[PDB]
Each structure stands twice: as C-alpha cells, then as structure tokens.
Symmetry: D3
Subunit: 140 residues, 6 copies
C-alpha cells in the first residue's frame, strides 16, 4: 500500500451503484415483502453498512479509516425486472472512499441474492460501478 | 436464517464468475504486470480466498461452515478488454456453497479494481453470476 | 477452555431473554416506527443474529461452532414501558449454545439502546437471563 | 448512521456498570479464585477491553473510532450476592463513547457468566446502564 | 488451499513453543508481577487462546476448523533470562493443528513483548517451533 | 491500556525482522517458486500486510490506529539456509507502531512455514526483533 501521510485533510466522498436482475415473480415477492417480517431491503441495507466499515479487512492494500457516514438506498424497478442499489460514503481524511462505496453496494447485492436463492438460481448481479468522487471532482 | 439440522451430509459444490471491464492500456499494465513485484492477479487471488472464508460474517443470514477447498482463477482477455475471474468452492455439510463462491469472485473483482484505481476511474464490474451447484444438480 | 472431544453429538438448544426499559414517549417512537424507514426492531434483529455467530470471538474460552438456527424475536410492551427480546439458538454438536443465545439477546438490547440514545439517556438494560437448555433438560 | 463530520473535536468520556447476580457458593469460588490459575476477573477484564474496541463491528450503525483508554474494573460484593462491573472509556473525536462503555461492561458480564456456567444455571445479568457522559455533561 | 474432503476423521494434536529473551530486571518485574493487578502471564494466555481460534483468518490458505482444546502455558526461567511459552491444541477433523499451536505461541510471545515495551526495547523473540504432531506420529 | 490523549502528533515509524530457517531443498522449492503459480513470497507479503492492520485485535491492550504505510520485504539467503523477512510500518498519531511491525513479520514468517509444512516439519522461526523506532530515536 502507498504512503498517505503527505497529501491530506479534506471532505472525501463517493457514490456507487449495483444491480440485481431477476424474474418478475421473484421481484414480486421482495416488494410484497417490505414492511413485513423479514424485509429483504432492510437486511441488505444493514449488511451494506457493515461491509463498508470492513473494507480495509477485505481488500489487502486498502487503508483503514473512520467513515463518518454510510448510506445504502434500495429501489425496486418492475419495469426492468431488477433492484437498484445506490450507496454513499463520506469521511474527512487523507484518502478517498471509492472502495467503501463499491464494497457496500456489492455486499448489499449479495444479500438480496442470498435471500432469493431458493426461488431463482439464475439471477445476475451487475453492473457494479462508481458515479462520483471528490483535486479529482468526478461527477455524473 | 432457516434451520439446517434436518437434511444433511453430502459433497456440496459451486462455481461462480465475475468480470472487470477496462481500457486496453489499463489491461496492458496488469498483464505486464504478473510474475513481477506487486502482481495484481496474485493479490486478488489471495483476497478472494479470504473473502470466501468470511462469507457468514458478511451476509447476515448465511450459516457458518468449514470450506474444504477454495479456488480463485484469473484470466486476462485482451480481445474483450477485461479480466475473467472464475471461482470454485467445496465442502461436505448440510448447506451449499453458492454464496461463498459468489463472494470470492466479487472481492477478487473489487481487489483488481482497487489496484487499478489511479489509472482508470470508469472501470465496470459485472456480471457476477453462478455457473454450477450440486438434489439440485445445476450445471452449465 | 475445557476439552470437548469426549462427550458429543446431539441436538443442543437454548433460549434467552433480555429487556430494555424506557420512557413511554421513547417506546412510542420505536413502535411508530416499525414497518417504515429505519425500523429499530429490524436492525436489532440483524445485529443479534450476527453477534451469536461471533460468540467464540468475544468470550475468550468459548468454543467455535456451526449454529444451524438463530432466532431473535422482539415485542413491545407498553404496559411495562419496555421492549422484550427473546432469542433461540440451535445446533448439532458436542457443546451447548447458552452463550450464543445470551450474546444475541445482549447485542440486540444494545442496538435498541444505540438507536434511542439521542432521546433518552437513562434507559436501563436488564435482566438478561436464560430460559431453557437441552442430560441437562432445563426448561421454564 | 448519521453524519458526524460537522460538530467535532473534544475529550469524550463515558462510564457504565453491569451486575451479575449469583448464589453465595458460586461467588465464593470466584473470589477464592483470583490471583491463582484461571482468574475469572482477569479473563473478564481482558474480554471487556477487546469488546469495546470492536463496538462498531457489533452495532450496525455505530461509527468506527480510536479509543485512547479503556478500563474494566471488577468488585465482588458478598453482601448482595453478586459481582459489580464498572467500565470507563475515553477518546478525542467527534462522537461519544457511550456504546463502547456499555459494550465492555456487557461482554465482561457475559464472560463471568460463561466461566460459572457449570455450577449455577440461573445466574442473572442486570442491570446494565450508563453513569456519566461528557455540551452534554451527564454525571451521576 | 488443498482439498481436505478425502482423508479425514481422527484425533489431531500439536504442541509448540516460543521464547522471549530479556534483561533480568525486566524479567523481575513480570514475576513480581503475577497474581497482582495486570498480570502479564494472564493477559498473554488469553491472547494466545484467541489467536489460535483466528488462525484461518490470519494465514491465507489455512482451513477453518473447530478447536476442541487450546492450552497456553507460561514459565519464567531466571536462569536463562527469558520466558518459555508452551502451547497445545487439539481437535477431531480431517486437518491437523500445527499452525494453530504455532500461532498461539507467537501471539502470546508478542503480548509479553507488548506489555514490557516501555522498559526494554531490545527484547528478542525466538525460537518459535513445533514439538509434536499426531499417519504422522511426530514426537519430541 | 494506558491513556494516549496527552502526548500526541508526529511521524511514528518502526522496522522489524524475522527469520525462517530450513533445509536447502526446502529453500530451493520456494525460490523456484517465485514468479510462477502459488508464489510463497507473494502470499506471505499479503498476509503480513493484513496482520499489521489487525494488530489491535490480536494484542489485548494495543490501541487501534490508522496505518498509513506497511511494507513487507522477503529475501532468500541460500548461504544461511533461510528466508529473511523485513517489515516497515508508518503512521501519524499519538502512539508508535512497534507492535504492528513485529506482528507483520511474525505472520509473514508463519505463512512461509504454513506453505512449506508438508516438506519439512522441523523448520524454526526466529529471531523476531525490532530494528528501529522514531523523543525515542531508536536506530540500528
């Protein structure tokens, strides 16, 4: 891992997104679903937040850090037969938080899949990519 | 999590795959790359194996288990501008290993991305899906 | 830790309970609450399940094990100004699961407290005790 | 979890307490006990200190942080048939340490229980509450 | 990691040893020391037991497993100016426990060092080696 | 653990070293070895870096911290029949990084041993000691 003690101190931020594609009946169960007993979206939200706080433990050369805010948003899209996962991570440090946002969106997607495993076996996860990161200024 | 003490004991197995898409110059650095100093493929292999052994800690309702074998294979495909990650997990128990194989392929893909972060910012991960799992007998 | 390789193999089980006492207005927010956005009960359920799977990592002389089933049930009791947390853990092994059930009820109670921290500062947790465990046969 | 990058920088502190109630003979073994071979108090002290450093990993929406000081004090009270656990946590940051102090007292109490499991099965843990926290200034 | 599902089931065992060398005054403090407040030997014993249970998480290609018994023994040797750490690990499985015993002796040695850091800076750890392991039958 | 909020803020650094002694044929396999498929040195490097980031989780009274740079260097020495492991850790904080450097060198040494287990059973690890640390100014 590269030294980070030199350039430092600013408000760093990143937003990532992930998708889980599935059948309509599978998506119907999730939606009907929410606000009940074992809400798939709520479980996935929690897992995503725990995952981002463990990013340095999963990616060998990532640097440990204090996240100040982590947000995992889920949205069902019946029109395209899939779930959209949007994440946001923020902190104040020397290094950015792009791996933390991607990691939360990936483990959220993996949790959705885990909970729908018994119904549909051919669900696909992807794509998983960044949306923004702030001398970089990456937006849209 | 659902009880698993009833149906049990057999050779369970699963294979998963993941893709990281990038520019040609980015892929050129990785390849040239290997067998040198900070081999991106070697790092990613290791991370993937550690990730699969932590699957129960990341996915809230997964069950803890003894993996007997975990294999993470990487292959560069200059033709399609991307890396192919193929994983394989095996054990002998009551539950299957589909989440362990998907988790190893996802964290391997995340490690490739982490190490190429400074060069290309718009790399895409996906798709991430299963290939096989064995009363199920899921092949191809 | 005492050796466990001798006496072994059976269906072990335990049930534990915990209580969080608070003001009526505090309990009113939780209840109104559920099935919405950041459901306190759902968060606490998840944390409790993750905690039980990490029991050997928190209690120095506990033995690692494969839990087959973990259940965290929450119930609001406006009559006594508090939340009742009931847990259940099961497995098939040489050792019992009393520490796993107590640990899930304690971290569930701690999560309820964490999420209500800003409102009421004098909330009390307790008691935390066992209800059953099965040559022991401990019931009621 | 709520953003913490705004209000920040001060000496934060909290003190928590926990109780384990048991039979006189059970308490007699612990006391007689100490300064010997497998000192129950020493084990519990250690576990409590490790638990507080893992608080963000157990409570889903807690924020990671650098504790500067963690103290777990145990005191046997034959008069009331129980052990008193008193904890203290300190750091310098944006967020307080109330969950870290409560978590150390709870896992210390759980370790005392674990080690006395074979003797008495009806030991009770509780109450578990805060004593102080420092614009808050919560004392006594 | 190599597959282990084939050859399996037996009582596996291993014993390891480690040494910390130091000045006489440093060793005098440790000894005088024990059975008091922050017993260096007791802390080191605990850490060693937690380390062995995390061996699969530290050594990338080790296999997860259920240890049934872990023992960390410390003995002060004023004659040679050092501490002797002896460990023992046991289980019933397909794989041996040589890495678990070496890992517990190494982290015990590291804990002794940590606690004596402020006094002597040139303490040396070593050697760290195996003593026995049981178709192998390695003794003495 | 001792409070660290008082004296603070500087560039802290430490370098540690470890040795694994083995037969010539064993060392020959490792060397021939590198830049191939399951490079022993690469695996050991990775493990060492993950270990240093977990030091506070293994040594009970160590303080959590943000490492800014961790370096694990391996060098084969056929002349003395062994591997030399040299580590370097850096950060900017109140506490030093001597335990982080020793911990990375110890787990790197343990990984080398793990991977050569099947060939030679009497390999020895040691010594494990510090080389430098910076009001201290410890060099050579």
């Amino acid at each position: 891992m590269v030294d980070v003690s030199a350039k430092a101190e600013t408000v760093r931020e990143a937003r990532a997104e992930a998708f889980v594609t599935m059948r309509s009946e599978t998506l119907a169960m999730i939606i009907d679903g929410r606000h009940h007993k074992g809400d798939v979206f709520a479980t996935a939200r929690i897992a995503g937040i725990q995952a981002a706080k463990r990013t340095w433990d999963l990616i060998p050369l990532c640097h440990p850090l204090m996240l100040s805010k982590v947000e995992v948003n889920l949205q069902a899209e019946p029109e395209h037969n899939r779930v959209r996962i949007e994440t946001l991570c923020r902190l104040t440090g020397k290094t950015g938080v792009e791996m933390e946002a991607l990691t939360a969106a990936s483990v959220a997607a993996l949790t959705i899949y885990a909970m729908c495993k018994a119904v549909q076996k051919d669900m696909v996860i992807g794509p998983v990519r960044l949306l923004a990161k702030s001398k970089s200024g990456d937006f849209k």
